[PDB]
Structure 1
Amino acid sequence: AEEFEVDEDGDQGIVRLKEKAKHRKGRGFGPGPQRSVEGWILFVTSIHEEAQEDEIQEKFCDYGEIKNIHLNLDRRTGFSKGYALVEYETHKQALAAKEALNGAEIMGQTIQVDWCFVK
C-alpha cells in the first residue's frame, strides 16, 4: 500500500530515547480525535478481569449505536485483558459516552475512557 512518510523528527526522538537508556540486553544489540473508517472509536481501560462483552455493550449502548466492541481476552488466563475498543456511529455519541463513562465503574471498579486515535 502507501509508503510510510519520512519522519526525521520521530526518527531522532527514538534515537534520544534509546541513547538515554542505561540498561541494555538482548541479541538485538549484536490532541484532537481522529475518525476511523466506519465510525468513532473510544479506548476503555481499567476494566475488571471478570468482565465480559455483555457488560460493556450494556454500559455503553445508551450513548449511541455501537458498531463494534473488542473486549480482548488475556491469552494465558482467559480473563479479559483490562481494556476495550468501543466504536460508535457518530462523533457526538462517542463524545457523550466518553464524558459520561470516564470515571464510572463496571463491576465495582473505576474505568477510564478516551479517544483511541488522534491527529
Structure 2
Amino acid sequence: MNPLTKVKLINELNEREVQLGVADKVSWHSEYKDSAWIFLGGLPYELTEGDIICVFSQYGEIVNINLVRDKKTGKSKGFCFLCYEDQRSTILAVDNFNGIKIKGRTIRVDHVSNYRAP
C-alpha cells in the first residue's frame, strides 16, 4: 500500500461522510479535538521550513514546525509534523491540502493523536 492510496483513502473518508450526511459534530475529525498537530508526508526532499510554512500558513498561524531529517546526512526524510495555533485550522488543512501536488510529489496530510516530542 503505497502512500498514494493513503491519500485516496482520506479523501474517500471525506466524500463518503458527505454522501452519508454527517453533522459537523460527529465528523471523523471530532475524535481529534484535543490535538493541533498534523502530519505531512510525501514532501519533496528539497522543501525547507520556509516553504512548508509559506504553504501551510494559509489556514492559521503556525506555532511549531518539526521537519524530520536523517541525522547522518542532515537531508530531509520527506515528512513533517506541524502544530497549528487552533485545532480548527487542522480541520481545515486536512480537508483542503491532502492530495495537492507540490513539484510533482503529491503530498498528504492527516491529524496526529498523541504526538511525542523528539
The answer for unaligned runs of 5 or more in structure 1 is 1-30
Q: Counterpart in 2 of 1:72?
A: 68
CA root-mean-square deviation: 1.6
Post-superposition offset of 1:86: 0.9
Q: Counterpart in 2 of 1:100?
A: 96
CA distance in 2, matches of 1:74, 1:34: 31
CA distance in 2, matches of 1:72, 1:79: 9
Choose between structure 1 and 2: higher helix proportion: 2
The answer for unaligned runs of 5 or more in structure 2 is 1-27
Instruction: Determine if contact 2:33/2:87 at 8 Å carries over to the other structure.
Output: no
Instruction: Determine if contact 1:49/1:82 at 8 Å carries over to the other structure.
Output: yes
Q: Choose 1 or 2 for highest CA Rg.
A: 1
The size of the alignment, in residue pairs, is 85
Instruction: Determine if contact 1:51/1:107 at 8 Å carries over to the other structure.
Output: no
Q: TM-score, normalised by structure 1?
A: 0.65
Post-superposition offset of 1:107: 2.9
CA distance in 2, matches of 1:85, 1:34: 17
Q: Deviations over 1:52-99 (max 9, x none)?
A: 111100110010111111112111232111111111111211111111
Tell whether 2:37 aligns with 1:41. yes
Q: TM-score, normalised by structure 2?
A: 0.65
CA distance in 1, matches of 2:71, 2:60: 30
